[PDB]
Every structure is written in structure tokens, then in C-alpha cells.
Amino acid sequence: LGSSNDNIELVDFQNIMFYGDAEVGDNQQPFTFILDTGSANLWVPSVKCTTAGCLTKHLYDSSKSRTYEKDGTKVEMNYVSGTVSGFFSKDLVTVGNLSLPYKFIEVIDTNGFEPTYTASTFDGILGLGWKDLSIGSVDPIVVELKNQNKIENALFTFYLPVHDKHTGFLTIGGIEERFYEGPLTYEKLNHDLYWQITLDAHVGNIMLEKANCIVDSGTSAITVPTDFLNKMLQNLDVIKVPFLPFYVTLCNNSKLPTFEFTSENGKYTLEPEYYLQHIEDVGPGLCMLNIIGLDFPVPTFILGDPFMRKYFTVFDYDNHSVGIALAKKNL
Ligand SMILES: COc1cc(C(=O)N[C@@H](Cc2ccccc2)[C@@H](O)CN(CCC2CCC3OCOC3C2)C(=O)CCN2C(=O)c3ccccc3C2=O)cc(OC)c1OCc1ccccc1
Known part of the structure; x- marks a missing residue:
């Protein structure tokens, strides 16, 4: 009863970034994400992360999630503005109102992502690229949700917020006029x-x-x-x-x-x-x-x-x- 599509409200951050919230774990642990169409991996900081950056962020605790599934494969995620390392993990992932067991990276070391990390207000990054662009060859969430038959179109849209004018929306599932x-x-x-x-x-x-x-x-x-x-x-x-x-x-x-x-x-x-x-x-x-x-x-x-x-x-x-x-x- 409403929009057959999944809409995630987007907040602007000083005209340089905009964030969106998503959850990880059976218990719905909240997180602020930077929706990057430039990468193809999802990572959240762990409670095991002991670097300074992490003390200000929201942290994922697997022990609190019943649906957590240990993997432990070590991985190093690198962007143009930094690197972060951790180990793979799988757990429920809630984006809007669509939840699915997805595989993400648990980050424990963010010292190679400073001062970017500390200077910014997000917890993790949610990639929106293509599988050939990801680490560990992980299918895009929007694609997964398709195969899992939770959406009909493997597509999402962006209606960026405008600093001081209005907020934005990421829509998963369909196009809105x-x-x-x-x-x-x-x-x-x-x-x-x-x-x-x-x-x-x-x-x-x-x-x-x-x-x-x-x-x-x-x-x-x-x-x-x-x-x-x-x-x-x-x-x-x-x-x-x-x-x-x-x-x-x-x-x-x-x-x-x-x-x-x-x-x-x-x-x-x-x-x-x-x-x-x-x-x-x-x-x-x-x-x-x-x-x-x-x-x-x-x-x-x-x-x-x-x-x-x-x-x-x-x-x-x-x-x-x-x-x-x-x-x-x-x-
Ligand atoms: C919001 O600010 C910005 C954030 C990012 C900024 O860092 N943006 C990345 C997202 C981000 C946002 C906020 C904080 C940190 C990181 C991301 O969108 C850029 N990007 C995609 C496009 C790009 C951009 C630049 C490139 O050079 C070579 O290939 C490029 C692809 C990558 O990092 C690709 C990573 N990546 C690869 O490079 C690569 C190569 C081969 C296989 C697989 C990959 C892969 O996954 C970039 C900016 O433009 C340069 C910004 O403006 C300025 C800026 C830059 C540095 C520090 C501060 C501010």
C-alpha cells in the first residue's frame, strides 16, 4: 500500500556528499552510507576496528546478530582517496524495506582512509557499480534483489538533494515520473x-x-x-x-x-x-x-x-x- 518501489531519502552534506541509511544484521543495526556508483562493494566498520576513526562511527557487532554467517576471508578495499581492510562476512542487509543475506566487508583498519574518514560523517560505503568492478566478485545488491525476486527491475535512480533547497531520493526498483x-x-x-x-x-x-x-x-x-x-x-x-x-x-x-x-x-x-x-x-x-x-x-x-x-x-x-x-x- 504505497509506492511499489523502494525509496531511500538522501541528505546533503555541505554540497560535497550526500548520505543514505541502511541496516546490517538480523537486529537492524543502523548505518550511514555514501552511495557510490563508483565502486562495487559494501563495507561497514566493525566493533573489532580499533583505529581512531572508528571510535566516532557506528559499529557492527556480529555476536548480536543471529543471522550472522562467518566467512573471515581477508580483503583490502581501495579507492582513489584511501584504503580500508577487513575480512568478509555475511549477514542480513536491510536497504529501505528490502532485506537480503548479502556479503560485505567488515572493516577493522581505517588508518589508510584518513583524514577522509574522520573528516567525513559517514560509516561505510555502499557500492553501486558492476560485479567486474567488485572484490570477491560479488553481485550488485540491486541485481541480487532481482534474482531473489524482491524487485522486478534491476535498476535504481538518483534524485540528488540540493544543498539548501531540498533532499533527495535513491529509488530501487523502478522509475518515477x-x-x-x-x-x-x-x-x-x-x-x-x-x-x-x-x-x-x-x-x-x-x-x-x-x-x-x-x-x-x-x-x-x-x-x-x-x-x-x-x-x-x-x-x-x-x-x-x-x-x-x-x-x-x-x-x-x-x-x-x-x-x-x-x-x-x-x-x-x-x-x-x-x-x-x-x-x-x-x-x-x-x-x-x-x-x-x-x-x-x-x-x-x-x-x-x-x-x-x-x-x-x-x-x-x-x-x-x-x-x-x-x-x-x-x-
Ligand atoms: C566527494 O569527493 C570526491 C571523492 C572521490 C572519491 O574518492 N570517490 C570514491 C567514493 C568515495 C566517496 C567519499 C569518500 C571516499 C570515497 C569513488 O566514487 C571514486 N572512484 C570511482 C571513479 C573514479 C575516480 C577517479 C579515478 O582515477 C582513476 O580511476 C578512477 C575512477 C574510485 O575510487 C574507484 C576505485 N577503483 C579504482 O580506481 C579501480 C581501478 C581498477 C579496478 C577497480 C577500481 C576501483 O574500484 C573522488 C573525487 O574526484 C577525484 C572527489 O572529489 C574530490 C576529492 C578527491 C580526493 C580527496 C578529497 C576530495
Whole structure:
């Protein structure tokens, strides 16, 4: 009686991250998660974790869960911003109202994930990538839930919150018309690794054909190939190596370009107001260009939160693709 779909409310954290709650264990031990479409593993800190970081987080106690199932296989999870190690374990996992015996990593050592960990307010990370991207070859939860016949579509959507405007939602199971407007385009993945797609980029005169776009919820910014970044930054009001770093500019700079991503079936644009972090409290119309330079073997743009904040996105395991639509401003 309600939404046939599973909705998890999302809270924004300083416009750099947003969290969601899920539970682990027969007894429903609560946890704050960072929903990362950039990784494919789920881990929670253990009560056995004795590092400083862990003293402020919520901890999983297997001895309290009847459904706990020991595994003990040692594993080391590494991201771009750090590593965490622990051993595998299996226990009930409750995401929203869908529970399932899932296999996660129990973390006991987070000293290689600082100051990120301690500086952030989450307990663990819930990967949403593909199995080829995970450790121990674990099927994605959203996929599992499908095989276990708890949902009909191996898909989830993101309606990112907007710092100071509204909260967001992760929907597991189906697409809801209330989050977007305008057509809902679908782009195919070029690899069943990350939610990566191919698009043409256009800025000033700058153009990059068949660029690889990775859509990541765990990236506070938009990444761009370095060369692409500086050609872009020529003349525009912006220094190098600030006081709270990177690129800064008067939020009112009329020279700021609008990104253009076009495909065979869609055209998506990101205006300055979407990639500009504010810091006017440091200067009347002062802003933090939210664009990082990053080079991959082949031209790759990481469409992070700045993009997912403007555009509603659907991730489809069944039809291997990422759907994009104009996210509603307030529902
Ligand atoms: C929210 O903040 C950010 C968090 C993360 C940030 O750390 N984000 C990761 C999630 C996260 C969020 C908060 C705290 C910690 C970690 C994650 O989404 C990034 N990511 C996916 C896309 C990426 C991103 C960058 C890459 O370089 C090479 O391959 C990349 C894939 C990975 O870490 C992949 C890990 N990973 C691999 O690398 C890899 C290679 C081969 C097989 C399997 C894997 C695998 O599972 C990243 C940011 O962009 C760079 C942020 O903005 C800035 C930032 C960066 C460092 C410190 C602080 C702030």
C-alpha cells in the first residue's frame, strides 16, 4: 500500500556528499552510507576496528546478530582517496524495506582512509557499480534483489538533494515520473565496469569527440582532461593555488562557458551555475570552479554530482544503460 518501489531519502552534506541509511544484521543495526556508483562493494566498520576513526562511527557487532554467517576471508578495499581492510562476512542487509543475506566487508583498519574518514560523517560505503568492478566478485545488491525476486527491475535512480533547497531520493526498483521532466534519454554503456558512456563535449571552440563519460555519485566535482581544462581556463578570471585551493572566480564572470554533451539521441548541458561552488563570504561574488583536471588512458570526463544535481539519472542493469532526464527543481 504505497509506492511499489523502494525509496531511500538522501541528505546533503555541505554540497560535497550526500548520505543514505541502511541496516546490517538480523537486529537492524543502523548505518550511514555514501552511495557510490563508483565502486562495487559494501563495507561497514566493525566493533573489532580499533583505529581512531572508528571510535566516532557506528559499529557492527556480529555476536548480536543471529543471522550472522562467518566467512573471515581477508580483503583490502581501495579507492582513489584511501584504503580500508577487513575480512568478509555475511549477514542480513536491510536497504529501505528490502532485506537480503548479502556479503560485505567488515572493516577493522581505517588508518589508510584518513583524514577522509574522520573528516567525513559517514560509516561505510555502499557500492553501486558492476560485479567486474567488485572484490570477491560479488553481485550488485540491486541485481541480487532481482534474482531473489524482491524487485522486478534491476535498476535504481538518483534524485540528488540540493544543498539548501531540498533532499533527495535513491529509488530501487523502478522509475518515477515525479523526479524529472522533458524527455528521458537512454545512453548505452561502453563497458560493464563503471556506468560509463560515450559523448561529444563542447565548451568554447573546444571539442572532444567520443569522450568516455563515467557517471559517479561519489565525485563532488566534474573531472576533465587537463589539456581540456586549461585551454578552457585561458583568460577567464581565475588564479592558481588559492588559500583554499584550485580555481576560483567571481561568480559573476560572464566569460564562463557552458558545457555541451551531445549523443545520437540526446543533448545535455551544464551551465556555470551548476559547476560553481560559492565562497562569496570570502569575496563579493567569489566562487570555486568545481572542475578538476584528471587524465585517464583515453579522454575521460567524470560526470559527478554537479551533473547529477541538474539531471535525474537512472541506472539499468537489465538494459545496460544510463538514462538521463531534466531533474525537477522541486518536485
Ligand atoms: C566527494 O569527493 C570526491 C571523492 C572521490 C572519491 O574518492 N570517490 C570514491 C567514493 C568515495 C566517496 C567519499 C569518500 C571516499 C570515497 C569513488 O566514487 C571514486 N572512484 C570511482 C571513479 C573514479 C575516480 C577517479 C579515478 O582515477 C582513476 O580511476 C578512477 C575512477 C574510485 O575510487 C574507484 C576505485 N577503483 C579504482 O580506481 C579501480 C581501478 C581498477 C579496478 C577497480 C577500481 C576501483 O574500484 C573522488 C573525487 O574526484 C577525484 C572527489 O572529489 C574530490 C576529492 C578527491 C580526493 C580527496 C578529497 C576530495
